Design a protein around this ligand. Structure first.
Ligand code: MN
Length: 538
């Protein structure tokens, strides 16, 4: 239990000192808190936050007071009480599974993974959010990028052995022309939406592709038709009917990533947490699979010669090898096992008859109305999996985190692009404003924001992480545990964040597709990629 009024008066007692107005404010607030056993969890949290805020104002008011030590310990006590509130007051999690595939056609292996979730979760409603107006964004990005690569490679022309025409110069010029093409497109798009507001993204993109890159409108209509057909046959849920999202203050951010930057990952980041906040349930990336039944392989000890991750991949590859639920799944790891272990897998799996003996079911999940739960990998939290009751407190904190970081980004970015200038001068105005607005609390973050316009077209850019990805989740967690909003500099350690992990049993993250998805544009692959562009062009 949290300390009561008398107990804090004893902790925070200083002889011959009268009780100040602020102090009485703290003690009254604590007394009121212990009289809310019949209030909602959120209400109790808010009272704990009002308490913490009052305690801070007292500490700031009487800086060298003798009560500050006890009151600081009381702050710690408040954080612990919040953890107890989150842990001892659970609610049902709405039985929804949320996936996102936007900007193009969904491939067969994604639908195979989703189908696994469907098969062992018949009681859960499944949403695969898509954007029916924007099936061509990825196509636009691919063709603009390919055109930039050709322009740059021609730009090198004869001097290929000139050492100062290296991959760095290649990517700096390629970025320049990509930026020109991108702002050309954004201008045409805003012109069209002014001239004919009836038009949707794909009309504008299709006629743009026809005019500027000689693509065939008929082929693009076929591509749209087939993509729409495939996703609607697989639980498609159109984001253009997501009214709460369309009318909220994150929709313009979603469309910024979608149509201005062509970053389908950033847009999926924006959307998944709004979906979660409005509907509740569990969000998954399409390369995640259901958790394996815990006892399924209890009889097979993991050798010491293989890492934990190796063994996880092995389990899945065995299941797919002898049950064939997903065709063409890899066996790279399973095949490296000694013959005896291989047969242990084969026999355990021949023992089992129905997929429900291999994959577990989510069932009836419950969570705190304060929290959203996130997955973990060896590098920390990752939002490939999230669990939340509808309108949870943390889902609001995460939405606010993302909207505020975009506020900071766009406050400096929008003035620079408003002047029609090239990539380099635009970057200079933009970065100048960033550094002007930097301070100790947001320094690291701003250094990341600096690379915004290069996201997706340059090696070693980590802006999305800081803008819409895991950093905003960690920032929201800190907001909760600090009784504030707007954290920019994360000091929570892994033990703090573990208070929000999804049980390992609810997701299989070690899949073939996700190890594929784990590649980074690391500036060695940039070198290699340059080498197969000049090898593929000459
Ligand atoms: Mn992934």
């Amino acid at each position: 239990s949290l300390v009561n009024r008398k107990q804090l008066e004893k902790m925070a007692n200083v002889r011959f000192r009268t009780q100040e107005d602020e102090y009485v404010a703290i003690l009254d607030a604590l007394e009121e808190y212990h009289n809310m056993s019949e209030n909602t969890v959120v209400e109790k949290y808010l009272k704990l936050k009002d308490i913490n805020s009052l305690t801070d104002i007292y500490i700031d008011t009487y800086k060298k007071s003798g009560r500050n030590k006890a009151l600081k310990k009381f702050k710690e006590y408040l954080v612990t009480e919040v953890l107890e509130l989150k842990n001892n007051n659970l609610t049902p999690v709405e039985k929804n599974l949320h996936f996102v595939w936007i900007g193009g056609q969904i491939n067969d292996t994604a639908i195979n993974y989703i189908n696994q979730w469907k098969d062992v979760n018949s009681d859960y409603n499944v949403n695969v959010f898509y954007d029916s107006n924007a099936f061509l964004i990825n196509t636009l990005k691919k063709t603009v990028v390919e055109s930039a690569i050709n322009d740059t490679l021609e730009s090198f022309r004869e001097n290929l052995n000139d050492p100062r025409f290296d991959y760095n110069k290649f990517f700096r010029k390629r970025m320049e022309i990509i930026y020109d093409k991108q702002k050309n497109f954004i201008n045409y798009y805003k012109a069209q939406r002014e001239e004919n507001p009836e038009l949707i993204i794909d009309d504008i993109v299709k006629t743009y592709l026809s005019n500027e890159y000689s693509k065939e409108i008929d082929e693009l209509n076929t591509y749209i038709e087939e993509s729409l057909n495939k996703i609607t046959q697989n639980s498609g849920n159109d984001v253009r009917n997501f009214e709460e999202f369309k009318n909220g203050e994150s929709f313009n951010l979603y469309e910024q990533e979608l149509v201005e930057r062509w970053n389908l990952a950033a847009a999926s980041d924006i959307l998944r947490i709004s979906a979660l906040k409005e509907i509740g349930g569990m969000y998954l990336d399409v390369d995640m699979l259901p958790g394996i039944q815990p006892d399924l392989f209890e009889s097979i000890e993991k050798p010491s010669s293989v890492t934990v991750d190796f063994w996880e991949m092995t389990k899945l590859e065995a299941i797919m090898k002898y049950k064939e639920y997903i065709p063409e799944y890899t066996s790279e790891h399973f095949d490296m096992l000694d013959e005896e272990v291989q047969s242990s897998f084969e026999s355990v799996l021949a023992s089992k008859s129905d997929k429900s003996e291999i994959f577990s079911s989510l069932g009836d999940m419950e969570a705190s109305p304060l929290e959203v739960k996130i997955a973990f990998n060896s590098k920390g939290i990752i939002n490939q999996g999230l669990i939340s009751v509808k309108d949870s407190y943390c889902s609001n904190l995460i939405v606010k985190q993302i909207e505020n970081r975009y506020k900071i980004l766009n406050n400096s970015l929008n003035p620079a692009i408003s002047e029609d200038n090239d990539f380099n001068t635009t970057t200079n105005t933009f970065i100048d404003s960033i550094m002007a607005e930097a301070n100790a609390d947001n320094g690291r973050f701003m250094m990341e924001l600096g690379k915004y316009l290069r996201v997706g077209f340059f090696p070693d850019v980590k802006t999305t992480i800081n803008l819409s990805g895991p950093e905003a989740y960690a920032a929201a967690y800190q907001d909760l545990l600090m009784f504030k909003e707007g954290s920019m500099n994360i000091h929570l350690i892994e033990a703090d964040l573990r208070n929000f992990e999804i049980s390992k049993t609810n997701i299989s993250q070690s899949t073939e597709q996700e190890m594929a998805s784990l590649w980074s544009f690391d500036d060695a692959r940039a070198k290699a990629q340059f080498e197969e562009y000049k090898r593929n062009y000459f």
